[PDB]
A paper describes a structure:
The pro-oncogenic cellular activities of estrogen receptor alpha (ERα) drive breast cancer pathogenesis. Ligand-dependent transcriptional activities depend on the association of coactivator proteins with ERα to form functional complexes. SERMs and SERDs elicit a structural rearrangement of the ERα LBD to sterically preclude binding of coactivators in the activating function-2 cleft. Activating somatic mutations near ERα helix 12, Y537S and D538G, enable hormone therapy resistance in metastatic ER +breast cancers.
We solved x-ray crystal structures of antiestrogens in complex with Y537S and WT ERα ligand binding domain (LBD) to understand the structural basis of differential transcriptional antagonistic efficacies. LA-3 possesses a 3 R methylpyrrolidine (similar to OP1074) and showed a SERD-like profile with an IC50 of 26.94 ± 0.4 nM and maximum normalized fluorescence of 0.48 ± 0.07 at 5 μM. LA3-2 and LA5-2 are subsequently referred to as LA-Deg and LA-Stab for Laso degrader and stabilizer respectively. We discovered that addition of a 3R-methyl group on Laso’s pyrrolidine induced both ERα SUMOylation and degrading activities, while addition of a 2S-methyl on the pyrrolidine leads to an accumulation of ERα in the breast cancer cells. Interestingly, the Y537S essentially neutralized the SERD activities of LA-Deg with a normalized fluorescence of 1.01 ± 0.04 at 5 μM. LA-Deg induces SUMOylation but to a lesser maximum than fulvestrant and GDC0927 in WT and is further reduced in Y537S, while LA-Stab did not induce SUMOylation with either receptor. Laso, LA-Stab, and LA-Deg showed intermediate efficacy. In these Y537S structures, H12 is slightly more dynamic and the S537-E380 hydrogen bond is no longer observed. Overall, these structures present canonical ERα LBD homodimers with 2–4 monomers in the asymmetric unit.
Author numbering:
A (entry chain C): 306 to 332, 341 to 416, 421 to 459, 470 to 528, 537 to 543
B (entry chain B): 306 to 330, 340 to 416, 419 to 459, 470 to 528, 536 to 545
Write the structure that this text describes.
Amino acid sequence: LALSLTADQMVSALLDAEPPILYSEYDSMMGLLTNLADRELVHMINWAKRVPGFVDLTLHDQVHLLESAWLEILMIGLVWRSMEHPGKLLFAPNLLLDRNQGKMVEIFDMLLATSSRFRMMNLQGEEFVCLKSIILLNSGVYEEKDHIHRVLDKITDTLIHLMAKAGLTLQQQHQRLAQLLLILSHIRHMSNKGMEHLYSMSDLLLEM
Amino acid sequence: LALSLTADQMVSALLDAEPPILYSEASMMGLLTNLADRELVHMINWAKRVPGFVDLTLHDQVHLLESAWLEILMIGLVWRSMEHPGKLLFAPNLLLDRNQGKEGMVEIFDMLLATSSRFRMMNLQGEEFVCLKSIILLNSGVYEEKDHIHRVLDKITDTLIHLMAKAGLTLQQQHQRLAQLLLILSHIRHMSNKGMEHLYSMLSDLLLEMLD
Ligand SMILES: C[C@H]1CCN(CCOc2ccc([C@@H]3c4ccc(O)cc4CC[C@@H]3c3ccccc3)cc2)C1
Ligand SMILES: C[C@H]1CCN(CCOc2ccc([C@@H]3c4ccc(O)cc4CC[C@@H]3c3ccccc3)cc2)C1
């Protein structure tokens, strides 16, 4: 029944679905980020459940979707809040790191670049939550399958609706749509590069 | 001077630019490498006939091909594999199913097969296909020169939209399908990444000499 949402209801539903911005433990850099990510993962699951259409999926469908998307969700979230701090990544309000402290400057330079990209594009928060939802439903998808594609189509409708209300021309609307979606493919890329470094060292999702 | 180009002529240019289909020559990893290596040459010549590409500095052209070359091979493979369900047409004389796919390679195979199915379900057209392939070339390595590329990318999106509108898809159906196509590109990024991993655990000089 979640496919009956109007575009504005979809946005409002996504905005209040938003997870908090966590802080880093006050009182060895990888640990701080690992600790942060672990705590971040917990609200991400309660977030995903509030994504329209998500809970309709069988629970092992939900688990496959989250296992594929989670690092991308983390990455776009980080990049999102890092937007208004050029040359730096805001992992937490008390943990704002620069280029030099990165040394993973391979992945960080990528993360910074994406942040610059969102900034030049002047990405709005309303567009942001759509993109994050898109990532959840799309990264893992390669009755159940088509429902997902129907949900994805609704988010597309919503994104366009946002751009029309913003006063962008029809041409500008599908161009901006194209630009944002291509950016997702470089978030996929980052996740992957992030993943293999992440094993230069899967089931709590059902439990959660 | 390639941006001064109507959507129809744009599709024309890309279509005629299409590379030929090549024939097949760890028996198999030696077969796919020879084929891919041969396929790689025609890709350079294809890339140069892609609108906006030769206006780029040579250093950037190499960089784009370095980032994208595997993605190009994969989507092309996926493309000609459409009408052959459950199989991969690496070549007219080399048609494989996933059984023959079996080290580390069956997972990549299955990914390529799903992509092929998705194109089949969506019923991807040739006009659209060549548009996507261009987007990959210019998008994959995108991270005066770095906005020219974004103009071309916008021009190709117009072209895609142009095609869906002519087809009779409504404005809503148009942007829905545009999105459906571009999201598939992120799967192809993923396949390429896992592909690079799988190849290291077993190009520039060519690209530079190749782009004589
Ligand atoms: C999925 C859980 C399994 C146990 N945990 C492993 C650590 O997971 C991460 C994921 C991301 C990071 C870094 C980070 C942390 C918080 C955040 O909001 C965003 C990011 C962006 C990725 C970043 C990173 C990138 C590449 C290698 C390591 C860490 C660190 C650890 C997380
Ligand atoms: C950069 C060039 C110089 C070194 N060469 C290494 C060979 O790279 C490849 C690329 C693709 C493949 C397989 C293939 C062959 C032909 C084709 O038209 C498409 C593809 C898609 C990928 C496929 C592959 C890629 C990676 C691991 C296993 C299989 C195999 C070897 C390529």
